[PDB]
Amino acid sequence: HALQAIVLSDSYNYRFRPLTLDKPRCLLPLANTPLIEYTFEFLALAGVQEVYVFCCAHAGQIREYIEKSKWNLPSSPFSVNTIVSRESLSVGDALRELDSKQLITSDFILVSGDVVSNVPLNEVLKEHRKRREDDKNAIMTMVVREASPFHRTRARTESSVFVIDKKTSQCVHYQANERGKHYVSMDPEIFNEHEELEVRNDLIDCQIDICSNDVPALFTENFDYQDIRKDFVYGVLTSDLLGKKIHCHVAKENYAARVRSLQTYDAISKDVLSRWVYPFVPDSNLLNQTFSYQRHQIYKEEDVVLARSCIIKARTLIGAYTKV
């Protein structure tokens, strides 16, 4: 199955902007490893064979890294190309543009920013595929991760209320969790054709979406759409798009999350020091480092000299040639 993925880099570039002036956001190190590599490893796991990276801020340095990267080699699982367009792209703008090129072939993966995950999207695809095989008006299935409502990795954006048909796993209601919004307002018509629904405030909205080839054209149409959740999903539900259905894949294992905020960057990074996203762990040395795991979650590369009477405590990662 020829699969492709679209990575919207440069998206949350403004949040980290004392940084992202020298480097770009996707080249920022999480745990001594550039964020873009986590995304690539995840897509490679998903079985993606074609990657397009929308970027602008330092798009030269980005394209350079990708050129000199692990993924430009003959062994690389996919083929990564880059797209340079005018900065501050919305998700809709990239998708509308994506349509003008007829780049999209079949079903594809749409992620914004950088994704740190070890969820095998293989089964999510076959689910999405066979669902389209029977009915082609199913255009997107959203990968979300089970959690608890107050969960630490569940932030402002990930905090959303979903209502899913318990048997068809079709999303019949979505609403982001804003303050001052004290209610969940559903249109009573849903209840006479979906009848065991599940209201869920425990999900982590990873915004890892598996979209169909219709979606770019559906963004050329309805040219007012900017955010993949705020406008598009709302549109399908409130029927701006008339006959479209979207689904949820609530993953119950592994890890998914996106590096969007400065605080999420902190959150995910220590979720990485903990072995939550294995094998994507410092001591796996994917970029040929020399890390080693020790008790109380301390990670040390080689050639690191420690003074005596020095106290390195738990959850600490030390790069090579570092002296204390």
Place this chain on the structure above:
Amino acid sequence: FDIVQVYKKFLQDDPEITMPVAAIEALVQLLSRSQAKTISEFMDILQNGSNTLKEGVQNNISLSAGCDIFQRFVTRSLHDVGDFEQCKRHLVENGKLFIQRARACRQRIAHLGYPLIRDGSVILTHGFSRGVAAVLLAAAKRHVRFKVFVTESRPSGSGCLMTRTLKNACIPTCMVLDSAVSFTMNRVDLVLVGAEGVVENGGLINQIGTFQLAVFAKHAHKPFYAVAESHKFVRMFPLSQYDIPFSRPILEFDDPSPETPTPSDAIHNELIMNEEQIRNNPTLDVTPPEFVSGLITDLGIIDSKSGVSEELIKLYL
């Protein structure tokens, strides 16, 4: 020719030599000054020479090992259409080029031993051993953070010399009495000792306090590693940890006829045994192989210790 005088001679000549090697050098410089030229004459020789050597030094095990290695090298290339003389020069020629490897064996040991010490561990050693020191020092240069308990090793008092040796390399040290070794085992991560000789079953012949450490180590579930060069392997099989040739009469009692208070905190250094009494105590003990975790040699770390037997098997045919 006073071979004995010679053997002692090297011993003072060079602190880093081993008793077996010193015996090998002994036989070599006898084989230099040896007029010989009869295999009967040629091989009558040392045997009275190592015999004379064996009878000339009181505790003779280690030099016997170096001996045993020498003659087996002799007869095995005197077998083989063996001419005498070519081995006579070749031994005298490469005598300097013997205490080469012997020194290279110890360094090979240290390069194998030092990774056994890892960051933040506490080592326990009994008395002074060049091999143990070599391992500890080699680890120290690699900037490894560790500390070492050293047993005051009576009667030899080797604990002081080893403590100072390790102090010079900026290694944190602490001395313990022979009676307090058991109390320290919970703080010990690894025990490391040397050995004058290693018997057929892979057992250790060493200083008198060695086996007690191996006993405490087994009881405290702590690894016990021995450090010895390959040429300390000797073919002799003690049937107990008490079965060794005694230099002097030992552990015998008084014969009194009608012959005519201390607290535990009190420290009386003037209340020790005299040397007349100490000469009634053993100089060495034997440590069974079941107390030895691994035996670090230049041949590598021997854990089987049916393997020390394997090597002695190869040595003899």
